[PDB]
Amino acid sequence: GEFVRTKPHVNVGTIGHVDHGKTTLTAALTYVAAAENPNVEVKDYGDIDKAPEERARGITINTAHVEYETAKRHYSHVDCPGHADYIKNMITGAAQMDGAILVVSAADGPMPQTREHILLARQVGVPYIVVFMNKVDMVDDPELLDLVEMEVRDLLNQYEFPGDEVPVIRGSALLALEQMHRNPKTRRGENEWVDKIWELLDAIDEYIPTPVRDVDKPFLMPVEDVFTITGRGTVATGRIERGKVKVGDEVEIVGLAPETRKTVVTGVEMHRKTLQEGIAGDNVGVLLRGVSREEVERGQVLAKPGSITPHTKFEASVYVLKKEEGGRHTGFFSGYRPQFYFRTTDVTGVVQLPPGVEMVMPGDNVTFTVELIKPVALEEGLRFAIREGGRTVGAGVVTKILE
Ligand SMILES: Nc1nc2c(ncn2[C@@H]2O[C@H](COP(=O)(O)OP(=O)(O)NP(=O)(O)O)[C@@H](O)[C@H]2O)c(=O)[nH]1
Numbered sequence: 001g002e003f004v005r006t007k008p009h010v011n012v013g014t015i016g017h018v019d020h021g022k023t024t025l026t027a028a029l030t031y032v033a034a035a036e037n038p039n040v041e042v043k044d045y046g047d048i049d050k051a052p053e054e055r056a057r058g059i060t061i062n063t064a065h066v067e068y069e070t071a072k073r074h075y076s077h078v079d080c081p082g083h084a085d086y087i088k089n090m091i092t093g094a095a096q097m098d099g100a101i102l103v104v105s106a107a108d109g110p111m112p113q114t115r116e117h118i119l120l121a122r123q124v125g126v127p128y129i130v131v132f133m134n135k136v137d138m139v140d141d142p143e144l145l146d147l148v149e150m151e152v153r154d155l156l157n158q159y160e161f162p163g164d165e166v167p168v169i170r171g172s173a174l175l176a177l178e179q180m181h182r183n184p185k186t187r188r189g190e191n192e193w194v195d196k197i198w199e200l201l202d203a204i205d206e207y208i209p210t211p212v213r214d215v216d217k218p219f220l221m222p223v224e225d226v227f228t229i230t231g232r233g234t235v236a237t238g239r240i241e242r243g244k245v246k247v248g249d250e251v252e253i254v255g256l257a258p259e260t261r262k263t264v265v266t267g268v269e270m271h272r273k274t275l276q277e278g279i280a281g282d283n284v285g286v287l288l289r290g291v292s293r294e295e296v297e298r299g300q301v302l303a304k305p306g307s308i309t310p311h312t313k314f315e316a317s318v319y320v321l322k323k324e325e326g327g328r329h330t331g332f333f334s335g336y337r338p339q340f341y342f343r344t345t346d347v348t349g350v351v352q353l354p355p356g357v358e359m360v361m362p363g364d365n366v367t368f369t370v371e372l373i374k375p376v377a378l379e380e381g382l383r384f385a386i387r388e389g390g391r392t393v394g395a396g397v398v399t400k401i402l403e
């Protein structure tokens with residue numbers, strides 16, 4: 001049908017180590033919210049981990065976007081993979097979040113991708129974190145629980161989140177989900193596990209603010225995914241960063257190709273509901289005329305024509321991770337060619353150290369020059385992550401555009 005705005009819109013999502021319960025929690029949130037609001041459609045576990053490859057490998061691979069609502073706000077929720085080999089997909093998900101739910105298993109405590117996701121969430125601009133300590137149904141010992149919370153709070157402090165202040169809600173995504181399957185009309189106050197999901201929803205409502213967005217600036221939407229809808233055409237999805245888009249608007253597809261391409265927007269939807277106008281903050285699908293899914297891709301941005309010129313060369317200030325943060329064991333030299341992650345963009349780049357700087361070591365705060373192999377929408381002050389060989393090695397911020 002159509003999309004009617006009634007309340008503020010906020011983008012959230014789930015991050016955390018593999019198997020800690022992100023997808024089960026995402027499902028539980030839809031069920032719990034649906035009992036109290038008839039406009040929420042429930043999403044079961046298999047509705048989220050829906051792809052054949054996810055069923056095959058037994059993990060989340062692709063991000064999933066689900067919708068739910070509280071009395072206060074409307075949410076789009078991006079559920080990210082925790083597996084170490086799908087960090088690239090997690091980064092693109094986090095690039096869409098106004099706040100993240102960090103899921104940590106009470107039975108395991110923080111693990112390497114608990115650290116890595118916190119670190120990366122920061123580098124794609126996630127401003128607030130709420131913690132859900134999951135699987136408490138498995139942990140009687142209340143000292144182990146206090147310890148996990150302590151460790152998580154301290155870990156957040158390491159990446160400049162306010163660790164001693166974040167809400168930490170203790171619950172079981174699975175038992176709440178079970179209760180909602182047995183009674184889909186279960187209301188707040190009836191069930192112990194469901195009420196913990198309400199505690200989480202309250203914390204999301206109140207701790208994660210609605211961000212200041214600018215709908216007056218030129219339209220800009222980083223592309224998070226692209227697909228073909230049968231009988232309609234190519235859809236590029238993403239969170240609108242600023243400005244507005246209406247059907248009939250000409251937009252430019254910027255980045256990753258040798259040259260920029262223009263086309264006309266022929267549809268805008270949020271959660272498969274028709275939008276008269278997409279605005280900053282909306283999580284939308286934009287139907288694009290006359291382009292195939294091989295002509296638009298993740299990491300490009302849609303923009304008002306002429307408003308963004310992509311770049312290839314820049315200066316940056318970089319912190320190189322110590323190995324005690326899952327970084328490199330050894331340093332690197334000029335000519336090092338890692339992957340650079342800017343918002344939803346992932347691109348190989350060449351490190352060109354200045355004359356006199358022979359080597360960069362883990363733990364170093366350093367400045368250098370990067371030449372990307374493809375043009376990308378870039379901006380001064382833009383944060384990025386650096387990865388190489390399947391591990392995060394650095395965190396940086398663009399100092400100055402050179403080209
Ligand atoms: N005992 C218990 N098990 C739970 C709970 N929540 C999830 N699990 C179990 O933990 C396993 C992983 O759950 P899942 O939601 O897929 O985790 P994930 O964090 O989304 N995995 P991935 O990192 O691959 O996306 C499943 O076997 C699930 O049943 C819980 O509250 N209690």
Ligand SMILES: [Mg+2]
Pocket residue numbers: 022023024059060079080081082
């Ligand atoms: Mg999952």
Ligand SMILES: [N+]
Pocket residue numbers: 048049050054060061062063064
């Ligand atoms: N998924």
